[model samples]
Target chain A: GSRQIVDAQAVCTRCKESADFWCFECEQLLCAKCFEAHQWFLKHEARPLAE
Target chain B: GSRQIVDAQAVCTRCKESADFWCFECEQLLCAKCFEAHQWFLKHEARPLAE
Candidate 1:
């Protein structure tokens, strides 16, 4: 059968690393490493990837 | 040294079979059989080849 990855998992869009978080401002997945490392990015909305 | 090659689609890194997915951890193309094993072994993520 075909799939849309609804049942599949997601990784970071930037580096393909594990992503437990999502940033709506950029609509990009970010791992804890990148999430915390980028300070000015705090200007945008940030939240957990779990939806 | 590189020489003449046979015609083929992409092959799996785990089993040398035909490829359907790509593993992010090792950056490898994988087959159905090895895809599960690779996921369970390292808990890495994968995506469709077409994507």
Candidate 2:
């Protein structure tokens, strides 16, 4: 959302769940929980979307 | 804060705004008031990142 929480009518690739956070490295929004569950953790930590 | 309180979104590496209050200890997410004031305290005060 959060930061860029768009209007519900908008076309967000991610709906309301399944994203851990927005991956600036991957350039995508991931459900908060899903991203954590991902196997790859260290692949991108420093630039974890600047937040 | 003075009034409203929403779910924490993220944290700021430097400031202390809700925008930067995600820090639990250094957990970040300071708050809006903190955000504005923290753009960079000043070259005189400390680290300045206003720009």
Candidate 3:
């Protein structure tokens, strides 16, 4: 299936970084490094990179 | 800002596919395809994909 990317315009709220990922559980945009740091719980789900 | 990505394990409830986006308003993990289909209202906000 074709993958579509959305919300490419939002920046990371924590660091003003160009967002590469979004954590729905946390309700925040995060870079690659930050995603790993904050993804602590098993229930938390991070969206896969569209690209 | 250090973008912190969270929630990387959820599958789309609608399609059972790998979720690439999450709509905080809807409180659901969405695939890129599903996100667009579901994100119809102006208030709907989808979290960006985490790399």
Candidate 4:
């Protein structure tokens, strides 16, 4: 069996941190701490969804 | 030293646990455990934004 978690506690699945902003670009929460990584590493920062 | 977490089990930043449902309403992951506080916790269970 697996441990159950409340949907409300959904942390940033990527960086494993609490997200400060939701990146509609990636369709995920953008935790402030992880923002830099999302930009340089993920190569998807400030990516406007209007593409 | 770092711990690894999967993307499916995104935990709550405040409560520090995996959330169950995405709270489009709150713009946050609505963990099965923290829903109540998100609704009426302005006066109680206070924590920092990074929480």
Give the best candidate by DockQ. 4
lDDT per residue for candidate 3 within A1-51, as digits (tens), equals 112663334445554443456787776766533654565534566664454
Best prediction by TM-score = 1
Q: For each model, chain A TM-score?
A: 0.59, 0.37, 0.51, 0.40
Return whichever of 3 and 4 wins on lDDT: 3
Off by over 4 Å in 2: A1-12, A17-20, A39-42, A46-51, B1-51
For each prediction in turn, the share of the native Cα contacts (below 8 Å between chains A and B) that it retains comes to 0.00, 0.00, 0.00, 0.03
Candidate 3, superposed: residue stretches over 4 Å from native: A1-51, B1-8
- Give the alpha carbon lDDT tens digit for every residue of B1-51 in model 1: 112672334446444433456677667766544664676676778766554
lDDT of each: 0.53, 0.35, 0.55, 0.45
What is the DockQ score, from 0 to 1, of model 4?
A: 0.05
Supply candidate 4's per-residue lDDT for A1: 15
- Which ranking of candidates, highest DockQ first? 4, 2, 3, 1
The digit string of per-residue lDDT tens for model 4 on B1-51 reads: 875533444546455543433444344444423643464564333222333
Error of 4 at B31 (Å): 20
The residue-by-residue lDDT of candidate 3 on B1-51, one tens digit each, is: 866445555556665543456777666776544654565545586675554
Just chain B of model 4: what TM-score? 0.35
The model with the greatest lDDT is 3
User: Which 10 consecutive positions of candidate 3 chain B have the poorest summed lDDT?
Assistant: B32-41
Model 2 residue B20 lDDT score: 18
| TM-score to native of every candidate shown | 0.38, 0.27, 0.35, 0.29
